[model samples]
Target: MSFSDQNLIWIDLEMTGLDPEMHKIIEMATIVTDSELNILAEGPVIAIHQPESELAKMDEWCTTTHTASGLVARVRQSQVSEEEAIDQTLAFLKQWVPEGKSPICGNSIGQDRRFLYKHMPRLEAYFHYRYIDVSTIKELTRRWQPEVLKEFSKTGSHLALDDIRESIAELQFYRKAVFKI
Candidate 1:
């Protein structure tokens, strides 16, 4: 496929905490979309199993939010290993994105990229080096053109798939309102 035909790989991972060294990924979701943000395929929301001790190490905010979202329970009961989750994620991406051509897209995506770097190195290398961070655009619009950005009503689900959907919608809003695309 030509560069213009490549899709964007949008991903979100729910983790025990922010620090990849101390924390572990509990869940992951990825969506493949064309340049227009039209969904080409939706991957499974993989719940990665983590030990109770590791789960307990989560920061206060993560503990509370994850518990409230039922993700804590899902992680506790999940049978999928981190490696298995990564493999599944890679297979999903391979089916949609051309090798190393798609840029990973999300809101505040750098944090997720760090986790991928540490925990899912193979998957990390599958994407382009660049990132399409919606939050970066939001920040610039907030300071430079505040009126152009529209607020997205977040459900505060904290689930990986839910978060990814919200992130996609948020970017779509920006495309229409801010970029007029």
Candidate 2:
């Protein structure tokens, strides 16, 4: 299939910290969309269990943000193991996304990709190496043509699903207002 014909896999993951070696994914969510951004399927929003010791390894900002978002609490109560969460996410992707076709899309998604490489290797290998990073657009517009693109007000919820929706909306806004499509 042509690149434009491929679906986009929009994903977001909440993690304990930035370093993939030291941190772990605490939550994940995905949305599959057509090239035109039409919603195709919503994958599982998974909360991964982490012991207090692991959670304690989170940095000050991570701890504060995750606590405020109640993800820390969710992690404590979650029964889903990391492996199980990865399996569920992979299953969802297998159903909706054709192998090696879709490019993962999200805001600042490289970090999430790194976490996937470490924690969810199979899921990481499912997509093409190329990605649709909205943050790059945001940065370029901010520097080059701030007046052309309207600002997207983020909820700062820091949850996986909400963040994915926000990223999609941000991209939609860019397409409509900036690209004039």
Candidate 3:
């Protein structure tokens, strides 16, 4: 669904592994956008890192994606143990979000929303609607134009903020090209 300002958040992250069970984000970022796709604010989302064992398998594969491993690079553990990471995230989000809130979700690109939900309280806020996934968009576009499909896979997805900008650009281009909107 199209965002209604604070209706959605665009996010991306580099995780230790791809498998949800094994993977946990090592680095992350998000772009808070308005309904019109205006950028409100964006940055790396801070999380109270979970325990090491709860994270992905630390090895060459993880190091390759994240460029760091073990204590130095990994989340190690909760960075803000005293308070809620989600609460902090929500508090930060409030600046961009409006009153009479609804659930917010990203692309489901990296299980970003799930990770965010895990840490924050008031999980019930997002429970009913559930996070939305836009992967179907990738699939549909690819089917429509083979060449255009490849653009989605362009090298350097970058971190989250860059990805959101690129994603928006790509979508706009798609509309102008396919629908002449």
- Compute each candidate's TM-score over C-alphas: 0.93, 0.93, 0.65
Candidate 1 residue-wise lDDT, 48-146, digit = tens: 999988988987899999999888888888899988998888877777777788788898999999999999998899889999998998898899888
Best by lDDT: 2
Query: Candidate 3 has what TM-score?
Result: 0.65
- Arrange candidates by lDDT, highest first: which order? 2, 1, 3
Clashing pairs in model 1, backbone N/Cα/C closer than 3 A: none
All candidates' lDDT scores?
0.86, 0.87, 0.51
Per-residue CA lDDT of candidate 3, range 61-165, in tens? 555644432322435543644145445545655666543354444455436555544433353353225443455565676688757665444344434456666
Least accurate 10 contiguous residues by lDDT in model 3 = 119-128
Question: Which segments of candidate 3 are over 4 A away from where they belong?
Answer: 1-7, 19-23, 47-56, 68-84, 99-105, 117-132, 150-158, 179-181
79 Cα displacement, candidate 1 (Å): 0.7
